[PDB]
Amino acid sequence: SSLPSLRDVFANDFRIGAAVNPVTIEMQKQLLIDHVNSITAENHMKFEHLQPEEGKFTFQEADRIVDFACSHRMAVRGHTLVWHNQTPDWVFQDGQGHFVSRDVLLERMKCHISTVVRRYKGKIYCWDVINEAVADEGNELLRPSKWRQIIGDDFMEQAFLYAYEADPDALLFYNDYNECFPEKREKIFALVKSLRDKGIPIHGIGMQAHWSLTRPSLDEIRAAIERYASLGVVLHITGLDVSMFEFHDRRTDLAAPTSEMIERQAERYGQIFALFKEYRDVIQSVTFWGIADDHTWLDNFPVHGRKNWPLLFDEQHKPKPAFWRAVSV
Numbered sequence: 001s002s003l004p005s006l007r008d009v010f011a012n013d014f015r016i017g018a019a020v021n022p023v024t025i026e027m028q029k030q031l032l033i034d035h036v037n038s039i040t041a042e043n044h045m046k047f048e049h050l051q052p053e054e055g056k057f058t059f060q061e062a063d064r065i066v067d068f069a070c071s072h073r074m075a076v077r078g079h080t081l082v083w084h085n086q087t088p089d090w091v092f093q094d095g096q097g098h099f100v101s102r103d104v105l106l107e108r109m110k111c112h113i114s115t116v117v118r119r120y121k122g123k124i125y126c127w128d129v130i131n132e133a134v135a136d137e138g139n140e141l142l143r144p145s146k147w148r149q150i151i152g153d154d155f156m157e158q159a160f161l162y163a164y165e166a167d168p169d170a171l172l173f174y175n176d177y178n179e180c181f182p183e184k185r186e187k188i189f190a191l192v193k194s195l196r197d198k199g200i201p202i203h204g205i206g207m208q209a210h211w212s213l214t215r216p217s218l219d220e221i222r223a224a225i226e227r228y229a230s231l232g233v234v235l236h237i238t239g240l241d242v243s244m245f246e247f248h249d250r251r252t253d254l255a256a257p258t259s260e261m262i263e264r265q266a267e268r269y270g271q272i273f274a275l276f277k278e279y280r281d282v283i284q285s286v287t288f289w290g291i292a293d294d295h296t297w298l299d300n301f302p303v304h305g306r307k308n309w310p311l312l313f314d315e316q317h318k319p320k321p322a323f324w325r326a327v328s329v
Contacts, residue, residue, distance in 0.1 A: 003319060006035040006312075009327045013280040015075060017287030019239065022064045024295050031291050031317055032072070039069040040077040040238070040287050042297070047087040050116055054090055054108070057115060066123055077238065077287065078124045080175060081113055082159045083131035084145035092146040105150045110162045117166035126171035128206055128238065129163045130156045134176055134187045141187050156191075157200050164201040175206030175238055180216035180224040189227050196231060205231075206238040210289070211272075212246050213264050218271055225275075229282040237276065239289035241310035242268055242322070243298055250303050257309045262321055269312065270325030277329050292317050 006016040017038030018028075024042075025032065032039070043049055044061040051057055069076045091108055094100050100108070117127065133156055135143045142148055147155045156174075163172050174192055178184050188205065195202045205228045216224075228235055244261045245251065257265075276283050290296045292313035299308050312323040 003034070004327045006327065007037040010277075010286070013277050014237075014283050015285040015287075017075075017077065017285055018291040019079075019287065019289045020065060020068075020291075022061050024290075025065065025068050027295065028291055028317065031313060032068075032074075036074060036291070038075045038077060038285055038287060039065060040079050041065050042289070043086070045079055045116070046083065046085075047081070047091070047112065049086070051112055052088055059119060062120075066120060070123055075285075076120070076124045077236070077285070078117070078120065078127040078170075079238070080128035080131040081116065081163060082109065082129060082133075082147060082155070084133075084143060084147065085131075092150060099146070099150055102151045105147070105155075106158055109147075109151075109155070109159060113159065113162040114166045117163055117170070121167045122169075124167075124170065126173055126204065126236070127163055127167075128175035129159050129172045129202070131175050132177065133174070134184060134191055136178055136184065141191060157195060157198065160195065160200050160202050168201075171203040171234065172201055173204040173206040173236060173238075174202055175208065177208035177210045177239070179205075179207045179209070179228075180220040182220065182223070185220075185224045185227055189231065192228075192231055192233065196233070202233070204234040204236055206236045208239040208289075209237050210239055210241060210243070211268075212243045213261070213268050214246060218275060221272070221275055222279075225279050225282065229279070235279075235283045237283060237286040240272075240286060241289050241296065241298060242272075243310050244308055245303075247302075252303060252306045255307070261309075265309075266321035266325045269322040270329060273326045274329040288312070293320075 010016055015038040016036050018036045019040045019042040021042050021044055092099055160172055176188055242265055244257050290311050293309045293311050294315040296308055296310050298310050314320050
């Protein structure tokens with residue numbers, strides 16, 4: 001009513017987005033209409049929800065998400081084309097059950113990318129082409145995956161070129177999490193620099209920002225933004241949430257967040273959006289992975305069956321103290 005609108009507050013700085021599905025669009029419709037000007041599919045544009053079997057395309061739920069966004073003047077981010085998760089086994093197998101060749105997987109990759117991207121061309125302005133290809137642990141640069149194993153390390157080059165051919169007006173993104181821990185930051189920077197230095201059409205880096213109250217520090221976030229911005233790419237914050245639990249905190253029995261967690265989350269969100277507003281010249285969109293605490297994937301990850309309170313609105317869709325600091329930067 002008298003509440004400020006997130007997209008309006010940040011009109012001059014970046015788009016404000018939310019990850020949704022057909023159910024949460026109904027359940028949180030008014031929040032979305034009042035606050036966001038960008039929408040991402042939380043799951044229904046991943047491989048397994050678009051081509052569950054070869055040649056069987058299931059666009060119904062993704063269509064509903066795109067339809068909602070377009071009927072409310074919201075942009076859409078496409079998430080995601082090539083990922084080591086949520087991809088069916090058929091993609092990598094032949095009739096016998098063995099792994100396909102590099103040429104066969106490339107044909108399947110191109111056909112998926114072309115069919116998916118062409119359908120939403122001119123409604124979807126950018127795509128997370130490659131998701132989470134960098135290793136999250138160890139000394140290696142690249143996480144193992146059947147994509148990488150079968151095609152080789154140039155699978156990402158091919159995926160970007162395929163998406164560019166299908167919609168050359170789209171902004172194409174490398175998207176990843178823990179993007180601000182220095183060791184991983186440098187892997188991501190190295191990987192993207194490598195692709196850009198080969199003329200590969202990668203225009204943006206997606207910072208998932210699945211963050212905690214403590215990690216990463218404001219200094220690590222600032223350094224990552226600058227390190228990524230120095231490549232000349234655009235920056236999207238693609239899956240922002242602020243977990244009430246650190247990585248080591250696998251507690252199951254907390255039925256409400258403490259006054260201290262709520263207060264420290266407000267302060268944390270205030271600091272994060274001040275930092276974003278400061279880098280408004282290179283950050284063009286900030287998407288939350290949800291919008292209110294009645295739906296969050298953090299309820300079940302990394303601990304199944306608990307509850308988390310990661311967003312700017314509570315389960316009753318009322319603004320949290322985090323809301324007020326976020327909009328007053």
